[PDB]
């Protein structure tokens, strides 16, 4: 399938059978990260990535791109676990310009420092 | 677009570039709140709002309207971050009567006390 | 409606008006559980169930089936609260083979020990 809309953003984060069933107590890390048009942190910011993930002693990720720029106004929410420096995550929600949008995002992670840059390539397959 | 179904509920909660990337440890607050047809807490209850949000030292919200009334039987789930006394949040899931439903909700907050009344105006744009 | 695709999996977990508005601090339990084709833990594993739930002192559940088998390659994510030994939960996300899929799952719980087997019956009503 070809997507009815493609978007690319970067956001910047600073840290600080077979196997049996496995549980543990979790701790939540909450983040609020700048989203930029290109790779550099000092390139134009177009919103904030806000969400959370988990440490055990944690493939789980929930976050929203809160977009607020001259061309993009809305939110896109993603949720799920995926264990490669690259993973897919489902679009799970949309508001504003991204009202009723659906699709997937490919997340590529440049790890450096406590500095992580995440390339997020959004392919929408339903667009309103 | 005009919604194929509109619903209005209130639920009642009782408490107790630019910026750099920002993380912290989070704490979860879980809530289980009555949903009513109208503004007053003592008006007919039609279900419970059950979910969680986060304190840092937190625009993130995940919750489900568990509806159980003479006219509404099902669940509606919402998730996302939005930083106005009014915000939008995406429908992310539905069961029962709201099976395969999609759309957005506008949330208006009356803050008082530790008492918060939230007006939730659901506009579905896909209805089964 | 008849589903365009039906799937059945089991996963195995090992523990260890009216009512006023109710909140509390929550603690998160994270789990990573084997998914099998049939009831027995020693039957073929087809992936891992990875997500979290909450203890108060908690009908909330978020998890992803990370499927990795000879016939199924993708993820399916579910989220929501539902208070019966059986409950429904909405599909909220999909990737890979389950890209753009939507529907509901019925979850049946066999409680034993700290051992819980969950029968998950997925009915997709949108398939790509």
Author numbering:
A (entry chain A), B (entry chain A), C (entry chain A): 28 to 43, 65 to 105, 110 to 135, 138 to 166, 169 to 184
Paper text:
PsDRR206 structure was solved by molecular replacement and refined at 1.95 Å resolution. The asymmetric unit contains two independent molecules related by a noncrystallographic 2-fold rotation axis and connected by a single salt bridge between Glu169 and Arg173. Inspection of the trimer shows that the loop between the first two strands is involved in a domain-swapping event, wherein the loop does not simply reverse direction and become the second β-strand in the same monomer. Instead, it traverses the interface into the neighboring monomer, such that the N-terminal half of the first strand β2 is inserted into the second monomer next to its strand β2, adding a sixth strand to β-sheet 1. At the top of each barrel and slightly toward the outside of the trimer is a substantial pocket lined mostly with hydrophobic residues. Two polar residues, Asp40 and Arg141, conserved in all pinoresinol-forming DPs but not AOCs, are also located at either end of the pocket. In this regard, determination of the PsDRR206 three-dimensional structure, and its analysis suggests that the corresponding trimer has three identical substrate binding sites that are spatially distributed so that intermolecular coupling apparently cannot occur between two distinct substrate binding sites in the trimer model.
Mechanistically, one electron oxidation (e.g. catalyzed by laccases, peroxidases) is envisaged to generate the corresponding coniferyl alcohol (1)-derived free radical intermediate (CA•), which then binds to the DPs. Bound substrate orientation subsequently occurs in such a way as to enable 8–8′ coupling at the si-si face with concomitant intramolecular cyclization to afford (+)-pinoresinol, such as in Forsythia intermedia, Thuja plicata, Schizandra chinensis, or pea (Pisum sativum), or alternatively re-re coupling to give the (−)-antipode as in Arabidopsis and flax (Linum usitatissimum).
